[PDB]
Design a protein around this ligand. Structure first.
Ligand SMILES: Nc1ncnc2c1ncn2[C@@H]1O[C@H](COP(=O)(O)OP(=O)(O)OP(=O)(O)O)[C@@H](O)[C@H]1O
Lengths: 48, 806, 107, 144
């Protein structure tokens, strides 16, 4: 808790489709939305 | 991470299908794994923005977004009422995968630096037409109301038949059948009434927008001649549209602008009416479901629809002009938007401080991929991240949007750039000059001088720097590969300038102005805010008092201020299961700690929030209020409902000073200080508050191991703003006993040097990684969806500050 | 103690038996989440023989319940971990340990 | 243009008559470019054309240029300088000596034709002599 701590960590990034939904009074946007993600390959421990 | 139960629990593995459903009405977010419900939900979260699907990952993954329709066939049926996400793509957009808030990209000749992205808001989907109910039509406009009502339908039916629409029993688009393509006086009652009201609304908005219009002709009124449409434009039932011919009516530019405004207002009125009736937007039209592809505010509409609406409104304006009315456009009233703070908007990218050059002749290039707000030049190592480039004396830059040289202000210089133009920046530290070239030609000032700046004091050196505004893209070439420079040979090589990174074995490291608010110690020389450390007296505990130095004077800065104490208090790992002189046993066995905030008389309690923040608080909200606090409830239950737990998570636990102002005192400046005390039981997770010794109704519950910083948010209204009092109460320990292990059993209040006041700073310098994850996104197919792949590992050595959990 | 919570399933059949050498990959953290050990950092699986009292009791029992190829989180109390003495300089006294153990193989 | 500028620098009636012409005719040298020896069109045109002259000399010839400038400072004649360079061509710079020469000569060879030429001692001496004379007289002009 006193000395600075070091460690090797993975870089993490995010990806989104250009789909934006929200709610507001008088808004023209639908309120219920649904999507899916299918996982094809995952290397659990590509690094440490 | 909160464990959630699902059949066959396992970390996401190949062939797994995760279904995510968002119901904004509750609001709630629910998950399903391989069709099985995930026994847990997010709910009661903030709704001030737009939600998007997102997947986060490290290297070694391959996933596919399934959004329905032709963008990924769902493997499981959406729950009833939920819409496929592909329907949410906006009219003027094409569905694709993108990163979030990227300051950097790849490009044909190297990395491209990217400025902030212009984001839509949830309020951008609310149509806001101009209010026209009180606009009573003057006699002339009232008279023309019906004629417009008929003529609009005439023109619309002519266009319908020209584009193919023919009369029929029902709206059969497949057979091109329209039931409403008849004479207006015979049009179905509902549509006729709507057309009539819209026709009147056109004149009404004409008046409301500020136009001055009245009769100026009757001879023309009786002279206008109607077009005779042939059998080809005749309907299946024999109906023939009658759009009056007015080929003698010309137009003016301001009138075209007003036509655009009228089209906007009309579309917004229609959208508001449809939303009231219960319609919504959808990329695919569904009339039974009341989903339309055009039910969006005019600004977001597609170009073709905008053109059609503008053409119709221009025809209406022409009809009025042909009637002879004097449609006079209103004067233009200037206004400002400044969506955000300019000083913190543009992203600044600079070379690392260690690359500062204190001598020689140095050259580099900056290609403007866009043509908007961008600045490029040289900066001193101590350049601030929250100041516009060249606003102060710490940078000499050129802005090519209009052509200006920036240093301690702006001056005309050079010429504006075009897309793909390369600005060559040169610094000569022997002559103490700075030169700018555009596509190899030296840019010159109005006086004709060929040096942008002169008499430059070397000081600590100079670094390449650029600034990109929202939506801007640049390409910084520091010349590591001399052959990559495009105009070095034309200008600079023979002049004796050297590429900035000519003989570097590695690319030059860069830093950027990250706009993530962070807490930093109050500067000892801050022009507006001063913090005084007051020692504890016999009747007073240790205190940290904030004062506004420049209050009640010209240049005074009055804005929301977010303060916290440097050290946190940490709740215990395990919570307990289920005179005025301290009693020694109680005071040495207690786990409750206390700290107060004094709001001095003259500082409005309605402008003060007192409490705690977690390490995660990063909101620099200039209009802060307790309703803006991030919050979310995680609810876990059984496979048959039966909620097990409902944990509330937030990053700001505060009370509002306005809750302790008596209604009698409301509206009057009190002459008494308001003392708000905060108590935290580190062994139970309970947080309570008191006002002037009276217990308040606000209470909070946090989970074990939580870290809380004492915090105060205040909008100053007096020279003496607030005071952190690190005192104690009867049988309650001071904050020092919780903060410092050596003082764990010491009841004497203390304020060691480490404990200090920090303020929230909107922008900070952050080092850009030398290498970035290579992510590949592509449309796998109409059934497979959109594939994201990342295979090459990438790691960094992270330095972690324990107390700040950063 | 020791609680075993599966992260990724194993074969479900092959469980370690006394005298067999378990080859595993693990990462160890304290209850508050501070990492203190990892065989993946050294890039070499850790091998230990069941019943020889080579590792802590929590590890013995948890890996005994684990199956070949399985990844699991072991939550080990102080009594099943270094207890009151702790590991001077590494693990504080009376510390609950959390391990992310993958049973690579048996030999 | 360099020869004309050299004549201007050497002769003194040239400068005086240029000044008289500009003062009398009230010619706007600033407008021409877009009273002051800086605005003198004679030196301005030479300064504008100088990059072309420098582009003829290879980076290696920089030392020979310095030696020729030193001679012209010693008031040697053109033939004297042309013989000095002819007889100490061996003082030509070597790329290995400096890292700057490496990339300078890399660019020079990358430029087509420049690498093809500059293999002739007569060409080298002529280039160095002319450019060095121009640079010397530019130094005299800039110096007050
Ligand atoms: N996309 C739109 N933009 C602007 N105004 C619209 C739009 N859609 C409908 N309106 C308004 O509603 C009216 C509907 O069109 P119109 O009255 O010409 O015929 P309709 O037969 O009632 O409509 P539809 O074209 O749906 O058959 C338009 O005149 C206009 O007043």
């Amino acid at each position: 808790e006193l000395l600075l701590q070091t460690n090797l960590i993975n870089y993490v990034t995010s990806i989104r489709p250009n789909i934006f939904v929200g709610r507001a009074e008088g808004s023209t946007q639908y309120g219920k939305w649904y999507f899916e993600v299918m996982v094809d390959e995952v290397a659990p421990f590509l690094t440490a | 991470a909160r464990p959630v139960t699902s059949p066959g629990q396992h970390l996401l593995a190949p062939e797994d299908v995760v279904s995510c459903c968002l119901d904004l009405s509750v609001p709630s977010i629910s998950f399903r794994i391989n069709g099985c419900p995930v026994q847990g939900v997010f709910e009661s979260f903030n709704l001030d923005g737009l939600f998007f699907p997102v997947v986060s990952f490290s290297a070694g993954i391959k996933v596919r977004f399934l959004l329905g329709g032709r963008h990924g066939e769902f493997k499981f049926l959406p729950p009833p009422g939920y819409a496929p996400c592909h329907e949410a793509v906006l009219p003027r957009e094409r569905l694709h995968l993108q990163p979030i808030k990227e300051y950097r990209r790849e490009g044909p000749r190297g990395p491209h630096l990217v400025g902030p992205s212009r984001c839509l808001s949830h309020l951008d989907f609310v149509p806001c037409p101009v209010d026209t109910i009180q606009i009573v039509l003057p006699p002339h406009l009232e008279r023309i109301r019906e004629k417009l009502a008929e003529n609009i339908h005439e023109l619309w039916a002519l266009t319908r038949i020209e584009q193919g629409w023919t009369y029929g029993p029902v709206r059969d688009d497949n057979k091109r059948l329209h039931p409403c393509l008849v004479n207006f006086h015979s049009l179905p009652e509902p549509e006729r009434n709507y057309n009539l009201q819209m026709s009147g609304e056109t004149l009404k908005t004409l008046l409301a927008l500020g136009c001055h219009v009245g009769m100026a002709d009757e001879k023309a009124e009786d002279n206008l001649k109607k077009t005779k449409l042939p059998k080809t434009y005749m309907m299946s039932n024999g109906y023939k549209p009658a759009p009056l011919d007015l080929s003698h009516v010309r137009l003016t530019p301001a009138q075209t602008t007003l036509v655009d405004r009228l089209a906007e207002n009309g579309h917004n009125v229609w959208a508001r009416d449809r939303v009231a009736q219960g319609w919504s937007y959808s990329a695919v039209q569904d009339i039974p479901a009341r989903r339309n592809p055009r039910l969006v505010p005019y600004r977001l509409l597609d170009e073709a629809t905008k053109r059609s609406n503008r053409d119709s409104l221009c025809q209406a304006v022409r009809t009025l002009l042909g009637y002879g009315y004097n449609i006079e456009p209103p004067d233009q009233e200037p206004s400002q938007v400044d969506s955000q703070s300019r000083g913190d908007r543009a992203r600044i990218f600079r070379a690392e401080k260690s690359y500062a050059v204190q001598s020689g002749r140095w050259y580099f290039e900056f290609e403007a991929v866009t043509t908007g707000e961008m600045r490029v030049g040289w900066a001193r190592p101590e350049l601030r991240p929250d100041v516009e480039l060249g606003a102060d004396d710490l940078a000499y830059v050129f802005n090519g949007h209009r052509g200006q040289r920036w240093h301690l202000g702006s001056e005309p210089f050079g010429r504006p750039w075009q897309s793909g133009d390369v600005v060559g920046c040169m610094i000569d530290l022997t002559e103490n000059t700075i030169i700018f070239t555009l596509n190899g030609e030296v840019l010159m000032s109005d006086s004709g001088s060929e040096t942008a700046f002169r008499d430059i004091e070397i000081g600590d050196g100079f670094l390449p720097v650029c600034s990109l505004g929202p939506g801007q893209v640049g390409h910084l070439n520091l010349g590591q590969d001399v052959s990559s420079l495009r105009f070095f040979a034309i200008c600079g090589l023979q002049e004796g300038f050297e590429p900035f990174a000519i003989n570097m074995q590695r690319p030059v490291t860069t830093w950027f102005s990250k706009s993530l608010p962070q807490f930093e110690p109050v500067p000892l020389e801050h022009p507006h805010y001063e913090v005084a450390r007051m020692d504890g007296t016999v009747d007073t505990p240790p205190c940290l008092r904030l004062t506004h130095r420049t209050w009640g004077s010209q240049n005074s800065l009055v804005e929301m201020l977010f303060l916290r104490l440097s050290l946190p208090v940490q709740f215990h790992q395990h919570f307990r299961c289920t005179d005025n002189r301290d009693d020694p046993e109680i005071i040495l066995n207690t786990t409750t700690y206390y700290y107060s905030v004094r709001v001095f008389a003259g500082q409005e309690p309605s402008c003060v929030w007192v409490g705690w923040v977690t390490p995660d608080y990063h909101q620099h909200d200039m209009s802060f209020d307790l309703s803006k606090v991030r919050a979310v409830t995680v609810t876990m239950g059984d496979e048959q409902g039966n909620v097990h737990s409902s944990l509330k998570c937030s990053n700001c636990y505060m009370v509002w000073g306005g809750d302790f102002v008596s209604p009698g005192q409301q509206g009057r400046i009190s002459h008494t200080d308001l003392v708000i005390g905060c108590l935290v039981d580190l062994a139970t997770g309970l947080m309570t508050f008191t006002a002037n010794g009276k217990e308040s109704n606000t209470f909070f519950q946090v989970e074990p191991n939580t870290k809380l910083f004492p915090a105060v948010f205040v909008l100053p209204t007096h020279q003496n703003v607030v005071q952190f009092e690190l005192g104690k109460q009867k049988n309650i320990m001071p904050l020092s006993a919780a903060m410092f292990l050596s003082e764990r059993k010491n009841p004497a209040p203390q304020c060691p040097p480490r404990l200090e006041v920090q303020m929230l700073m909107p922008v900070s310098w952050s080092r850009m990684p030398n290498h970035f994850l290579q992510v590949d996104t592509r449309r796998a197919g109409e059934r497979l969806g959109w594939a994201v792949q990342c295979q090459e590992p990438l790691m960094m050595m992270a330095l972690h500050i324990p107390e700040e959990n950063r | 103690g020791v609680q075993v919570e599966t992260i990724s399933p194993g074969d479900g059949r092959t469980f370690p038996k006394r005298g067999q050498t378990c080859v595993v990959h693990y990462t160890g953290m304290l209850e508050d989440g501070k990492k203190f050990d990892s065989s993946r950092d050294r890039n070499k699986p850790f091998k230990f023989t069941l019943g020889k009292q080579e590792v802590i009791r929590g590890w013995e029992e948890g890996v005994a319940q684990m199956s070949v190829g399985q990844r699991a989180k072991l939550i080990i109390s102080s009594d099943y971990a270094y207890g009151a003495t702790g590991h001077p300089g590494i693990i504080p006294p009376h510390a609950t340990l959390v391990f992310d153990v993958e049973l690579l193989k048996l030999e | 243009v360099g020869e004309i500028f050299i004549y201007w620098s050497k002769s003194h009636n040239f400068k005086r008559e240029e000044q008289n012409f500009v003062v009398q005719n009230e010619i706007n040298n600033m407008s021409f470019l877009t009273y002051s020896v800086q605005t003198s069109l004679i030196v301005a045109t030479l300064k504008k054309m100088l990059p072309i002259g420098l582009n003829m000399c290879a980076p290696t010839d920089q030392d020979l240029i310095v030696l020729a400038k030193a001679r012209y400072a010693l008031k040697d004649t053109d033939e004297e300088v042309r013989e000095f360079l002819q007889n100490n061509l061996n003082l030509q710079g070597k790329v290995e000596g400096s890292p700057s020469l490496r990339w300078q000569m890399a660019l020079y060879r990358g430029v087509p034709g420049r690498e093809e030429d500059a293999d002739d001692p007569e060409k080298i001496v002529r280039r160095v002599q002319e450019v060095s004379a121009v640079l010397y007289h530019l130094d005299q002009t800039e110096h007050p």
